[PDB]
Design a protein around this ligand. Structure first.
Ligand SMILES: OC[C@H]1O[C@@H](O[C@H]2[C@H](O)[C@@H](O)[C@H](O[C@H]3[C@H](O)[C@@H](O)[C@H](O[C@H]4[C@H](O)[C@@H](O)[C@H](O)O[C@@H]4CO)O[C@@H]3CO[C@H]3OC[C@@H](O)[C@H](O)[C@H]3O)O[C@@H]2CO[C@H]2OC[C@@H](O)[C@H](O)[C@H]2O)[C@H](O)[C@@H](O)[C@@H]1O
Ligand SMILES: OC[C@H]1O[C@@H](O[C@H]2[C@H](O)[C@@H](O)[C@H](O[C@H]3[C@H](O)[C@@H](O)[C@H](O[C@H]4[C@H](O)[C@@H](O)[C@H](O)O[C@@H]4CO)O[C@@H]3CO[C@H]3OC[C@@H](O)[C@H](O)[C@H]3O)O[C@@H]2CO[C@H]2OC[C@@H](O)[C@H](O)[C@H]2O)[C@H](O)[C@@H](O)[C@@H]1O
Ligand SMILES: OC[C@H]1O[C@@H](O[C@H]2[C@H](O)[C@@H](O)[C@H](O[C@H]3[C@H](O)[C@@H](O)[C@H](O[C@H]4[C@H](O)[C@@H](O)[C@H](O)O[C@@H]4CO)O[C@@H]3CO[C@H]3OC[C@@H](O)[C@H](O)[C@H]3O)O[C@@H]2CO[C@H]2OC[C@@H](O)[C@H](O)[C@H]2O)[C@H](O)[C@@H](O)[C@@H]1O
Ligand SMILES: OC[C@H]1O[C@@H](O[C@H]2[C@H](O)[C@@H](O)[C@H](O[C@H]3[C@H](O)[C@@H](O)[C@H](O[C@H]4[C@H](O)[C@@H](O)[C@H](O)O[C@@H]4CO)O[C@@H]3CO[C@H]3OC[C@@H](O)[C@H](O)[C@H]3O)O[C@@H]2CO[C@H]2OC[C@@H](O)[C@H](O)[C@H]2O)[C@H](O)[C@@H](O)[C@@H]1O
Ligand SMILES: OC[C@H]1O[C@@H](O[C@H]2[C@H](O)[C@@H](O)[C@H](O[C@H]3[C@H](O)[C@@H](O)[C@H](O[C@H]4[C@H](O)[C@@H](O)[C@H](O)O[C@@H]4CO)O[C@@H]3CO[C@H]3OC[C@@H](O)[C@H](O)[C@H]3O)O[C@@H]2CO[C@H]2OC[C@@H](O)[C@H](O)[C@H]2O)[C@H](O)[C@@H](O)[C@@H]1O
Ligand SMILES: OC[C@H]1O[C@@H](O[C@H]2[C@H](O)[C@@H](O)[C@H](O[C@H]3[C@H](O)[C@@H](O)[C@H](O[C@H]4[C@H](O)[C@@H](O)[C@H](O)O[C@@H]4CO)O[C@@H]3CO[C@H]3OC[C@@H](O)[C@H](O)[C@H]3O)O[C@@H]2CO[C@H]2OC[C@@H](O)[C@H](O)[C@H]2O)[C@H](O)[C@@H](O)[C@@H]1O
Ligand SMILES: O[C@@H]1[C@@H](O)[C@H](O[C@H]2[C@H](O)[C@@H](O)[C@H](O)O[C@@H]2CO[C@H]2OC[C@@H](O)[C@H](O)[C@H]2O)O[C@H](CO[C@H]2OC[C@@H](O)[C@H](O)[C@H]2O)[C@H]1O
Ligand SMILES: O[C@@H]1[C@@H](O)[C@H](O[C@H]2[C@H](O)[C@@H](O)[C@H](O)O[C@@H]2CO[C@H]2OC[C@@H](O)[C@H](O)[C@H]2O)O[C@H](CO[C@H]2OC[C@@H](O)[C@H](O)[C@H]2O)[C@H]1O
Ligand SMILES: O[C@@H]1[C@@H](O)[C@H](O[C@H]2[C@H](O)[C@@H](O)[C@H](O)O[C@@H]2CO[C@H]2OC[C@@H](O)[C@H](O)[C@H]2O)O[C@H](CO[C@H]2OC[C@@H](O)[C@H](O)[C@H]2O)[C@H]1O
Ligand SMILES: O[C@@H]1[C@@H](O)[C@H](O[C@H]2[C@H](O)[C@@H](O)[C@H](O)O[C@@H]2CO[C@H]2OC[C@@H](O)[C@H](O)[C@H]2O)O[C@H](CO[C@H]2OC[C@@H](O)[C@H](O)[C@H]2O)[C@H]1O
Ligand SMILES: O[C@@H]1[C@@H](O)[C@H](O[C@H]2[C@H](O)[C@@H](O)[C@H](O)O[C@@H]2CO[C@H]2OC[C@@H](O)[C@H](O)[C@H]2O)O[C@H](CO[C@H]2OC[C@@H](O)[C@H](O)[C@H]2O)[C@H]1O
Ligand SMILES: O[C@@H]1[C@@H](O)[C@H](O[C@H]2[C@H](O)[C@@H](O)[C@H](O)O[C@@H]2CO[C@H]2OC[C@@H](O)[C@H](O)[C@H]2O)O[C@H](CO[C@H]2OC[C@@H](O)[C@H](O)[C@H]2O)[C@H]1O
Lengths: 233, 233, 233, 233, 233, 233
C-alpha cells in the first residue's frame, strides 16, 4: 500500500496499465488545500481532499488514468491509442463511493486527438465526459437533449474549451439524470452517438485516454473505488 | 492566495482595512486541535478547524477584524473609532456558509470603549454580539426578550464578562430566531436599541471594532465567506 | 492536555489506572491513514481518525484500556486480574458521542486468560465484546439469539479467532439492538450469562482487561468521551 | 510513549512529579513554527522545534517543570514550595544533548515567591537561571562577575523583568563559561551566593519551581534528555 | 505574522510593493517535498524547504518579487517597468542567512521585456541573475570572465533558456567569487556592463522585475531575511 | 514520482523487482517520529526520517528490498531464492548520500533460509549485514577479525538474534573500516568467506533477499540513492 500527497504524484498499478494521478491543475490561485491519493489494492484505492473555495472553477481532478495524459505516450497495455474507425469496444467498469461536502462530480474524462503519437505537448481535439455523480455542479457548454445510452439516461452538453494559442477542444458531457455508484459502459456507444447520430465527431480521430476521477470545485471529502477496469477489445 | 495556521496569525486584505485572524483565545487547556485561516480573494476566504472537546468553553474565534483587537490602534481606513453620539451608520454585509459538526456559532462581535485611543491593553467596556448561526450553543447572560431589528427577529441576552482585576465588560447578544447565511445590518440599529430603548449603553462610548467569526466550542468543519464589508458612514 | 499520533502511543490518566491507546493493530496493509488520541480532562477525551478503505478487516481499535493489553501485567489500581469464581462486580460507565462516516463500532473488549500473571506474550483464551454502536459493521462468528441483560437488548454472537500456532480465543459479541450513547453495565451479568446460562465459559478464568473503543473498518471521524470508569468491587 | 504538539500541552511523568511542557510563551507575533514534546521513558524524552526568526525575543521555553508554573499549586511530590530559611538541599541532575541551528540555550529556570500558596496568577518575585548551554544568545541584565559554584565557573548577570502593572521579578542568570551536556547541581549553592554573598535575595522567600528547558530565539533542532531529577532534601 | 505552504501562495508586504512567493516551478516530477513561506515583519521573513532529490534541475525558487512575475502587470509602487535608456538607479539591499544542506543558491533574478505592458503570458527577453551564495551549484550557459562591479567580484556566464515555441530568453549570471550574506547593489551597474561593455543588451528594453530568492536543486533548510528593499530612483 | 509515510508502505519500481519499504519494525515503544519513503526515478529515490531517541535499539530500517521480506514469496524477477551451492554471482551496486544527525548506519541486509519457499511467517536462519556507513553505532555480536573482501576492508562480527519460540538467526556483520558512499559488491564473496573460510554457513542454504537501507537508532536526516541494482547471474 502507498499514499502520496504532492502535485502530479502518480501511483501506478496493474503492471503500469493505470496510475492514480494527484492532478491539481486548477490550484494555482487558491490556498489552504490538500489532496492525497492512495492505493491499498486494486480493489481498494481512492483519494482524499480539502479544497476550501466557493468558486465555479475546477481546482483539481484526482483521477485514475489509462492511456495518455500530457505524457510522452500512453500507459503500457492500455490499448490506447485506438482509432474510432477501428470500432473497438472500450469497456469500462467502476464501482465507487464518495463522502464529501461542497461541489464536485465523479466523471470519466476521455481524450481524443488526430495524432496516434500524442506527446507531452499534444493538445487534444476533443474531450468526452461521463458524469456518474453531479453534486451542486454543472458542465461546460450548453444543454442539447436527454438521451438513453448503455441503459442509462444522460443530459448531453456541448461546448468548447479554449486552451490558448489556437489550442482547444470540443467538450461533450453526458450527465446521468440521477447519481449512481456503479456503471458498466462501452465508450463506443457514446462516440457512435456523437459521430453517427449528431455528426459532431470524425471517426478518423483516436481515443488517447480514458480517465475517471472527481472534479472538485470546493469542499472536503473522499472517494473510495472498489472496482475498476478499462479494456480495449 | 495564502493560508496560515499558527496562533494569532493575520491575513490582511482590502489595503489592510481588515484581517482574518487565527484567534485561539480559549485553547490553553485543550489539545488535538488545528485551525487554518485562508484568503483566495476578497470574495473567497474563510477558515477550517478541528476542536475536539465537549465542554461549554469557547476554544477559538477565528474571525475577520475591522478596527481594534487588543492592538495599538485600529486598522487603517476602518472608520473606527466612532463615537455613538456621532450617530454614524455602521453598515455590514456578509454572506457565508458553514459545513461542520459539534457546537459553534457564526457571530458579529462589536467592541466598545470609553477611550478613542484603545491600545493593546485597553479592556473594553462592552461587547455586542449578533449571531447569524447558533448550532447547539447559547450565549452569556440571561434572556431578556425577542425583538425585531433591521428586518430580523433576535433573542436578546444581557450578561457581564469578568476579565480579572476589575476589567470586564457588559455583553449584549442578539441571536437570530432562525439561522441565516446572509445579512445586511446597520450596527447603529442595535446600539440605538441598547441606548435609547433599554438605557443600557451610553452614547459617549466609542465603537472600536466590528468582527465576524465563528466561536467554536467543539467539533470540526469550515466556513467560507463569499461577501464581506463593514463601512462607517 | 495532550494529543498523540504515533502507533501504540499511550496517554495515561487517573493515576495510571487507565490509558488511551493509539491501537492500530490492523493497519499493516493499508495507507493514507492517521489516528490521534487526546486527553483534555478525565471527562473530555477521545480520538480522531481517517482510515480510507472499503474492506471488512478491522484497521484499528483506538481505545481506553484498564488492566492488561499484551503488557507485562495490569494497570495499577485497575482491579485486574479478577477470577470469575470470586464473583466481583465489574461496573462500567461510559458516555460518548461519535461523528463519523464509513464503517465502525463503539465496543467494550473484555479479555480473559487462564493465568493471573498475563504478560506481553500471553494469548487470551476468550474475548467478550459489548457493542454500544454498530455502524455498517457486523461481528465475528454466528448469531445465537437476542437477550435482555442489564436492562438492554443484545444480539449475541459466538465465534473463534485463530491467532496462529494454536493461539486463539473464543469471541462472544453482544450487539445492542439499537445504538446508544451511554451505558452503565456490570460485566458480571454478561459473564454469568455465558457461564451459567450457555455453559460457554469456565469460572476458573480470570478477567484480565476491560477496554472501550471504536473498531474502525473504514472512514473518517471522531469520538468524544464525557464519562468513563471501570471499577472492580 | 507519547508526543504532543499544541501550545501548553503537558506530558506528566514520575507519578506526576514532573511534566514536560510545550511552553510557547513568546510566540504570539511569529509564524511558521512548530514544537513537539515527547516522552518515551523517564530516561528518553525531549522536544523538537522550528522557530524561524532572527529576533532577540524568546519565542518558547519547552521544558520540564517541577513545582509551580502559573498553576493552582505545585506538582505532587515535588517538594515545592520550600522556604530558603529552611536550608534544604535542592539537588538536580541532568544529562542531555542538543542538535540545532540558530540561537538558543539550555537552562534551568527557578521561580521564587513570597507566598507558599502560589496560584495561577501569582507573579514571582525572582527568577534564577542556570545556563548549561549558550548558543549565540545572551541573558537579561548586566554582567556582574565570574564565580565558581558547585565545581563549575559561571558568568553572573542581574536584571529585572517588568511583567506589567507592578508585577515583575529580579532575574539572576548564571552562564557556564563553556557549554556542558551534564551537571549535578545543588540550587542551594546558588541561592546562598545570592543571599549571603551578594545580599540580593531574602531567605524569607520560597522556591516555587525548578524547571529545565531550552529558550529558543530562532532556528530548528531538538534536545534529548537521558537523565533527569530534582529532589528537595 | 503569517506562513503559507501551497504552491504559488503569496504573502504581500510593504503596501503590496512586494510579495514573498511560494514558487515551485520545477516540482512537477518530484515528490516528498514541502516549502513554506513566512513573514513575521518586514525585517524578519523567509522560507523553509525540503526538496529530496539529487538532480541538477531547479525544483523551486521561493523568493521575494518586486514588479512583474507572469502577472497582469507589476506590483504597486515597485517602480517597474523602467526602460534601460531612462538610466534609473535600481538600488537593492539584502541581508540574509541560510542554514541548509544539499545544493542551492541565493540569487537575484531580474526580468526584462521589450514591452512596458507585461502580462501573464508575456515571455521575457532576458534574465539577469546575481548569485550571493552558490552551494554546490552552477549556472546556465558558459563562463565568460571575472569582473569587478559594485565593489564585488563576479564570475560572468552567458546562456539561453529555451521556453518552447520560440519563447526564450538570454540568461546572464553573475556569481560572487565567495559567498556573502549581505549586499548593496545597483542593478544599473550590471545592465550597463551588459549593454555598454559587452554589447549584449539593448537599452530599449525594460526592467520588469527584481526578485531575490533561493533556487533549490535538492536538500533541506531555510533562509531568513533581516533587511530587504528595492527602489527605482 | 511518489512519496509515502505510513508504516510498511511500499513503493515498487523496476517492474516490481524492487520496492522501497517504510520499515518501522522497532517503533512500538517510541513516539514523536516520522518516516517518508520517496521515488522520483530509479536514479533519484530515498527516505527522510525523524527518530527522537537516545537508545541503542533499532527503531526502523527504511530500505530497498529485492526478494523476500516476511512476504508470501519473492519479488518478481529478483533472482531469489538462490541456493548457495549453485554459486551464482549476486552483484550489487549502490551510490548514496546521507545528511543526518544522531546514530544510524547504511547497510545491506541479506536474508537466508533453509526453504526455497519462504512465506510470510518463515523465520530466517541467517542474516548477513554489510555496513557502508557506521555513524555512532555498532553491530550485534562479537568482533572476530578484519578482512579484505571485494577490495574493501571489513570488521567482521558474529552474533545470534533470538526471535522467540526457537526462532532466531545467526547475524554476520561486515563493517567497512571507513565509510563510503558507493560500492560494487558480489555477495558471493561474503558467503564464500563465511562458508569456506570460517565454516559458519552451509551452502545448502538459500539466499532469500538482498536489502539496502539505514538502521536508525535516533536522530533526523535523509538518504538519497543515485544508483541501485541487484542482479543474480
Ligand atoms: O508545459 C509544461 C508542462 O505541461 C504539462 O502538461 C499540463 C498541460 O500543460 C495542461 O494544459 C494540462 O491541464 C489539463 C489538466 O491536466 C486536465 O486534467 C484538464 O482536464 C479537464 C478538461 O480540459 C476539461 O475540458 C474537462 O471538462 O474537465 C477535465 C478534467 O478536469 O484540462 C487541463 C487543460 O488546461 C488548459 O485548458 C483549460 C485552461 O483553463 C487551462 O489554463 C489550460 O492549461 O495539464 C497538464 C498536466 O500538468 C498540470 O495538470 C496536472 C497538475 O497536477 C499539474 O500541477 C499541472 O502542471 C506536461 O505534463 C509537462 O510535461 C510539461 O512540462
Ligand atoms: O497581555 C499579553 C498580550 O495580550 C494580548 O491581548 C489578548 C488579551 O490579553 C486577551 O484578554 C484577549 O482575549 C479575548 C479574545 O481575543 C477575544 O476574541 C474574546 O472575545 C470574546 C468576548 O470576550 C466575549 O465576551 C464574547 O461573547 O465572545 C467573544 C468572541 O469569542 O475575549 C477574550 C477576553 O478574555 C478575557 O475575558 C474572558 C476570560 O475568560 C479571559 O481569561 C480574559 O482574558 O485576547 C487578546 C489577543 O490574544 C489572545 O487571543 C487571541 C489568541 O490567538 C492568542 O493566543 C491570545 O493571546 C495582546 O494582543 C498582546 O499585545 C499582549 O502582549
Ligand atoms: O510480539 C511482538 C510484540 O507484540 C505486542 O503485542 C501485540 C500482539 O502481538 C498482537 O497479537 C496484538 O493484536 C491484537 C490487538 O492489540 C487487539 O486490539 C485485537 O483485539 C481484537 C480482538 O482480537 C478481536 O477478537 C475482537 O473482536 O476485536 C478486538 C478489538 O479490535 O486483537 C489483536 C490480535 O491479533 C491476533 O489475532 C488476530 C489476527 O488477525 C492477528 O494477526 C493476530 O495477531 O497486539 C499487540 C499490541 O501491538 C499491536 O497492536 C496494537 C498496535 O498499535 C501495534 O502496532 C501492534 O503491534 C506486544 O505488546 C509487544 O511487547 C511485543 O514486542
Ligand atoms: O492570565 C491568563 C492565563 O495565564 C496563564 O499564565 C501565563 C502567564 O500569564 C504569563 O505571564 C506566563 O509567561 C511566562 C512564561 O510561562 C515563562 O516561561 C517565562 O519564563 C521566562 C522568565 O520570565 C524570564 O524572566 C527568564 O529569563 O526566562 C524564562 C524562560 O523563558 O515568563 C513568562 C512571563 O511573561 C511576562 O513577563 C515578560 C513579558 O514579556 C510577558 O509579556 C509577561 O507576560 O505564562 C503563563 C503560562 O501561559 C503562557 O506561557 C506558556 C504558553 O504556552 C502559553 O501559550 C501562554 O499563555 C495561566 O497559566 C492561566 O491559568 C491563565 O488563564
Ligand atoms: O499558462 C498557465 C499559467 O502560467 C503562469 O505562469 C507560469 C509560466 O507559464 C511559467 O513559464 C513560469 O515558469 C518560470 C518560473 O516562474 C520562474 O521562476 C523561472 O525562473 C528561472 C529562470 O527562467 C531561469 O532562466 C533563471 O536562471 O532562474 C530563474 C529562477 O529559478 O522560469 C520559469 C520559466 O519556465 C520556462 O522555461 C524553462 C522551462 O524549463 C520551463 O518548462 C518553461 O516553462 O512560471 C509562471 C508561474 O507559475 C509557475 O511557476 C511558479 C509555480 O509555483 C507554479 O506552480 C507554476 O505554474 C501564470 O502565472 C498563470 O496566470 C497562467 O495561468
Ligand atoms: O505475524 C504478523 C505479521 O508479521 C509480519 O512480519 C513481520 C515479522 O513478524 C517481524 O519479525 C519482522 O521484523 C523484522 C524486520 O522486518 C526486519 O527488518 C528486522 O531486520 C533486522 C534483523 O533482524 C537484524 O538481525 C539485523 O541486524 O538488522 C536488520 C535490519 O534492521 O528484523 C525484524 C525481526 O524481529 C524479530 O527479531 C528481533 C526481535 O527484536 C523482534 O521482536 C522479532 O520480531 O517484521 C515483519 C514485517 O513487519 C514488521 O516490520 C516492518 C514494520 O514496518 C511493521 O510495522 C512490522 O510489523 C508479516 O509481514 C505479516 O504478513 C504478518 O501478518
Ligand atoms: O467539467 C468542468 C465543467 O463543470 C466546468 O463548467 C463551467 C463552465 O465551463 C462555465 O461556463 C460556467 O460558468 O461554470 C461551469 C462550472 O460551474 C458549475 O459547477 C460549479 C458550481 O459551483 C457552479 O455553480 C456551476 O455553475 O468547466 C470546466 C472547464 O473550465 C474551463 O473552461 C471554461 C472556463 O470558464 C474555465 O476557466 C476553464 O478552466 C470543466 O472541466
Ligand atoms: O459568546 C460566548 C457565549 O456563548 C458563552 O456562553 C456561556 C456562558 O457564559 C456560561 O454562563 C454558560 O455556562 O455556558 C455558555 C456556553 O454554553 C452554551 O454553549 C455551548 C454549549 O456546549 C452549551 O451546552 C451551552 O450551554 O460565554 C462566552 C464567554 O465566556 C466567558 O465568560 C463566562 C465564563 O464562564 C467563561 O469562562 C468565559 O470564557 C461567550 O464568548
Ligand atoms: O469485532 C470484529 C468483527 O467485527 C470482525 O468481523 C468479521 C468476521 O470475523 C468475518 O467473518 C466477516 O467476514 O467479516 C466481519 C467484519 O465484516 C463486517 O463488518 C465490516 C463491514 O464492512 C462488513 O460488510 C461486515 O460484514 O472480526 C474481527 C476479527 O477479525 C479476525 O478474525 C477473523 C478474520 O477474518 C480476520 O482476518 C481477523 O482479523 C473482530 O475484531
Ligand atoms: O533568558 C532570556 C534572556 O536571554 C533575554 O535577554 C534579552 C535581554 O533581556 C535584552 O535586554 C536584550 O536586548 O536581548 C536579550 C536577548 O538577546 C540575546 O540573545 C539572543 C540573541 O539573538 C541576541 O543577539 C542576544 O543579544 O531576556 C529574556 C526576557 O525578556 C523579557 O524581558 C526583557 C524584554 O526585552 C523582553 O521583551 C521580555 O520578553 C529572558 O527570558
Ligand atoms: O540558475 C539555474 C541554473 O543553475 C541552471 O543550470 C543548469 C544548466 O542550465 C545546465 O546546462 C547544466 O546541465 O546544469 C545546470 C545546473 O547544474 C548545476 O547546479 C546543480 C548541481 O547539482 C549540478 O551538479 C551543477 O552542474 O539552469 C537553470 C535553468 O534551467 C533551464 O534551462 C536549462 C535546462 O537544462 C533546464 O531543463 C531548464 O529548467 C537556471 O534557472
Ligand atoms: O544491526 C543491528 C545492531 O546494530 C544492533 O546492535 C546492538 C546489539 O545487538 C546489542 O548487543 C548492543 O547492546 O547494542 C547494539 C546497538 O548499540 C550500538 O549501536 C547503537 C549505539 O547507540 C550504541 O551506543 C551502540 O552500542 O543489534 C540489532 C539487533 O537487535 C536485536 O537483537 C539484540 C537485542 O538486544 C535487540 O533487542 C534486538 O532488537 C541489529 O539489527
Amino acid at each position: 500500500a502507498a499514499s502520496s500527497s504532492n502535485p502530479s504524484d502518480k501511483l501506478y498499478f496493474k503492471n503500469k496499465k493505470y496510475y492514480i494521478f494527484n492532478n491539481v491543475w486548477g490550484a494555482d490561485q487558491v490556498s489552504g488545500w490538500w489532496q492525497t491519493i492512495y492505493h491499498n489494492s486494486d480493489s481498494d484505492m481512492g483519494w482524499v481532499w480539502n479544497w476550501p473555495s466557493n468558486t465555479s472553477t475546477v481546482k483539481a481532478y484526482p483521477s485514475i488514468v489509462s492511456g495518455w495524459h500530457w505524457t510522452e505516450g500512453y500507459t503500457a497495455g492500455s490499448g490506447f491509442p485506438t482509432r474510432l474507425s477501428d470500432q473497438k469496444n472500450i469497456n469500462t467498469k467502476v464501482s465507487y463511493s464518495i463522502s464529501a461536502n461542497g461541489t464536485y462530480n465523479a466523471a470519466y474524462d476521455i481524450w481524443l486527438h488526430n495524432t496516434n503519437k500524442a506527446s507531452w505537448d499534444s493538445a487534444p481535439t476533443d474531450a468526452i465526459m461521463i458524469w456518474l455523480n453531479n453534486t451542486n455542479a454543472g458542465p461546460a457548454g450548453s444543454y442539447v437533449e436527454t438521451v438513453s445510452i448503455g441503459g442509462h439516461s444522460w443530459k448531453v452538453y456541448k461546448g468548447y474549451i479554449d486552451a490558448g494559442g489556437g489550442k482547444g477542444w470540443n467538450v461533450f458531457s453526458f450527465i446521468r439524470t440521477a447519481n449512481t455508484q456503479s456503471a458498466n459502459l462501452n465508450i463506443r456507444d457514446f462516440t457512435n452517438y456523437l459521430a453517427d447520430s449528431k455528426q459532431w465527431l470524425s471517426k478518423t480521430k483516436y481515443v488517447s485516454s480514458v480517465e475517471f476521477g472527481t472534479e472538485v470545485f470546493g469542499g472536503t471529502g473522499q472517494i473510495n473505488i472498489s472496482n475498476w477496469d478499462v479494456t480495449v477489445r
